[PDB]
């Protein structure tokens, strides 16, 4: 049964190492969510600092890939950082060669093609991560594109990733069935972050303090992460209505 150890086909036409890499994705037990506003793209992710000895400021699964592109990872941190460093290198090389900022969807495709190579070439293992790329693209507007260990990628109106992704997904599905639009009809990103947090609270059934969340926001010409105090301001506004 060596068809389960390397990336070759099983008799069923399956790649077991790819399937097991998908399982490694949930090893962190962290749930992420991404939504789009009018002018922005918001990504939120659970933050869990179990050890008191840890420096909580260094515990993060959100990465600033370029000025415009942000990336949240669902999976172990070594593979997450492997993917982050590569995406940063690719985004920089793109800008140098072609004279404009790498689009979110093109980076996603590039990383997905790299992921595909690990599913076809035996000596390289798949990375056990799901990469969710976010930006406000200058042509396509607010953008969410997600990559997995299979090398699959697609654009999203909104998305969720983690152990409890299905609960978050259906919550978001039901909202967009009502509104009948592809985005959160909201002017400020602050209110789009409030929406994202609110709908994660409803979906997961858990309350959040400032240290339990981690937020990334993409606007036109920059992506940034919120501090604990910026999130606290968000949590106060949710509670007050």
């Amino acid at each position: 049964g060596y068809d389960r150890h390397i990336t070759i086909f099983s008799p069923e036409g399956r790649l077991y190492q790819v399937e097991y890499a998908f399982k490694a994705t949930n090893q962190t037990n962290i749930n992420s969510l991404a939504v789009r506003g009018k002018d922005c793209t918001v990504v939120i992710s659970q933050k869990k600092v179990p050890d008191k000895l840890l420096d909580p400021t260094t515990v993060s699964y959100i990465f600033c890939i370029s000025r415009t592109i942000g990336m949240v990872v669902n999976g172990p941190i070594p593979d997450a950082r492997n993917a982050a460093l590569r995406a940063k290198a690719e985004a920089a090389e793109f800008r140098y060669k072609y004279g404009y900022d790498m689009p979110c969807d093109v980076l996603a495709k590039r990383m997905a093609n790299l992921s595909q190579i690990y599913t076809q070439r035996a000596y390289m293992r798949p990375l056990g991560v799901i990469l969710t790329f976010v930006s406000v693209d200058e042509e396509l507007g607010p953008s969410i594109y997600k990559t997995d260990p299979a090398g699959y990628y697609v654009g999203y109106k909104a998305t969720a990733t983690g152990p409890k992704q299905q609960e978050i997904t259906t919550n978001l599905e039901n909202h967009f069935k009502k509104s009948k639009i592809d985005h959160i009809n909201e002017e400020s990103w602050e209110k789009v972050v409030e929406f994202a947090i609110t709908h994660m609270i409803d979906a997961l059934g858990t309350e959040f303090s400032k240290n339990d969340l981690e937020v990334g926001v993409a606007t036109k010409d920059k992506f940034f992460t919120l501090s604990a105090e910026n999130i606290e301001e968000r949590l106060v506004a949710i509670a007050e209505q």
């Binding site: 077991y16 097991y20 890499a21 090893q27 400021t57 492997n82 798949p126």
Partner: protein, 243 residues
């Protein structure tokens, strides 16, 4: 089964068993710790005196990278040395190109990516060390701990090896009892105590204490070994606390 025979193979769980087996080599090794203080970091390590024939103060375990970073590790000692050698190359090329000495977070990812790369192929073995390292850069003090998987985080206190649970419990008390922070000279004393307390797990053979530190005020942000009177003061403090 057979998923644990080759490195870089995912088990049906989503685990790399060879990396988990490297962790066992780390757990088998001597105790080493790191303490983040107000303006720096302190490193300490347990050195088992196998025999009277070992020359005291000679078999030095703690290693310097560049001039501002200290590294200590538990597990397979040669694997640790290999990682520090790489760390030194990474710190040299960073300084060569960018002039400034390598920041600690930047240095941490250099080791992180290198260790992680040794979980990507069956043609290499994972590292059999957990490495506690850190120092002072332009943004202040930083302490890190890096595992065989490539995983690393920033720490207030860190501990690894055979006496890690004992040490971790002692570090957790210091964090609770000193929220405003710990001084560099205090951290040296506490480091000595923690290694002495963690020695109950390796209690058969007697041991030799080794401490180092980087501190903005006490060492000008350079890595130095604790020697002579300051070392003996820490040993006396540690000996007093166990009795």
């Amino acid at each position: 089964t057979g998923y644990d025979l080759s490195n870089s193979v995912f088990s049906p769980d989503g685990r790399n068993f060879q990396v988990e087996y490297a962790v066992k080599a780390v757990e088998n090794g001597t105790t080493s710790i790191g303490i983040k203080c107000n303006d720096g970091v302190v490193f300490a390590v347990e050195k088992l005196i196998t025999s009277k024939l070992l020359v005291p103060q000679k078999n030095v375990k703690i290693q310097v990278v560049d001039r501002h970073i200290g590294c200590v590790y538990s597990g397979l000692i040669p694997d640790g040395r290999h990682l520090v050698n790489r760390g030194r190359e990474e710190a040299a090329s960073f300084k060569k190109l960018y002039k400034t000495p390598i920041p600690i977070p930047a240095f941490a990812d250099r080791l992180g990516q290198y260790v992680q790369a040794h979980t990507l192929y069956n043609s290499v073995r994972p590292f059999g060390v957990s490495t506690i390292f850190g120092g002072v850069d332009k943004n202040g003090a930083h302490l890190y701990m890096l595992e065989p998987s490539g995983s690393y985080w920033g720490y207030k206190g860190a501990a690894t090896g055979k006496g890690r649970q004992s040490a971790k419990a002692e570090l957790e008390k210091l964090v609770d009892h000193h929220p405003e922070g710990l001084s560099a000279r205090e951290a040296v004393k506490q480091a000595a105590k923690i290694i002495y307390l963690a020695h109950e797990d390796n209690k058969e053979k007697d041991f030799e204490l080794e401490i180092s530190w980087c501190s903005l005020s006490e060492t000008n942000g350079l890595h130095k070994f604790v020697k002579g009177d300051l070392l003996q003061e820490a040993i006396d403090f540690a000996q007093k606390e166990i009795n």
